[PDB]
Amino acid sequence: GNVARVVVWEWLNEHSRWRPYTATVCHHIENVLKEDARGSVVLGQVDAQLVPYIIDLQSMHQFRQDTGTMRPVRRNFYDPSSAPGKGIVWEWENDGGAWTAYDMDICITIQNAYEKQHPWLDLSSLGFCYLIYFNSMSQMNRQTRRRRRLRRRLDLAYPLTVGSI
Numbered sequence: 001g002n003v004a005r006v007v008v009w010e011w012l013n014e015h016s017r018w019r020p021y022t023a024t025v026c027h028h029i030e031n032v033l034k035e036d037a038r039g040s041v042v043l044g045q046v047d048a049q050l051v052p053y054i055i056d057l058q059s060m061h062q063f064r065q066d067t068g069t070m071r072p073v074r075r076n077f078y079d080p081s082s083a084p085g086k087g088i089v090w091e092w093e094n095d096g097g098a099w100t101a102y103d104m105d106i107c108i109t110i111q112n113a114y115e116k117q118h119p120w121l122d123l124s125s126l127g128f129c130y131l132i133y134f135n136s137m138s139q140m141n142r143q144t145r146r147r148r149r150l151r152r153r154l155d156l157a158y159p160l161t162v163g164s165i
């Protein structure tokens with residue numbers, strides 16, 4: 001018995017939410033893990049914005065030289081038929097104008113609703129008090145009625161590996 005599973009590396013933030021890395025970063029981590037289970041992933045080799053980021057596989061923690069934080073990381077897995085298995089990413093635009101990916105469980109839920117031709121999706125049952133409007137491509141706070149923009153891109157697919165039995 002062999003099954004396929006999508007590899008999504010994730011780091012725990014200050015709100016106790018597991019945040020995903022990008023698919024480019026996750027491929028680089030898995031290549032270091034294949035060669036050395038106790039190695040260090042130097043994300044500065046990938047892009048200049050990731051210079052202060054180091055992921056230590058020896059202790060499974062993220063090290064940031066620009067802030068000093070030590071935050072746990074995990075090697076999580078999702079279903080190949082979900083958005084990370086293809087490369088589909090849903091992102092929302094923060095106050096600084098930067099695009100930020102939703103949590104992976106929410107990203108997969110948004111993509112499932114979009115292809116089911118749902119005009120909108122309510123995330124309240126999943127903890128987020130937000131409404132996703134695909135017609136205006138926006139996210140609305142249920143309490144304040146204020147909105148942010150969101151977009152869909154076909155980025156890189158996250159790595160896929162084999163789980164035995």
Ligand SMILES: Nc1ncnc2c1ncn2[C@@H]1O[C@H](COP(=O)(O)OP(=O)(O)O)[C@@H](O)[C@H]1O
Nearest residue numbers: 092094095102103139140141144145146147148
């Ligand atoms: N999808 C999201 N995921 C994580 N954080 C978010 C998301 N949307 C907004 N935030 C954060 O919540 C804060 C503002 O929430 P928002 O609902 O936009 O404000 P308001 O309460 O004024 O409507 C910001 O710090 C923003 O970074």
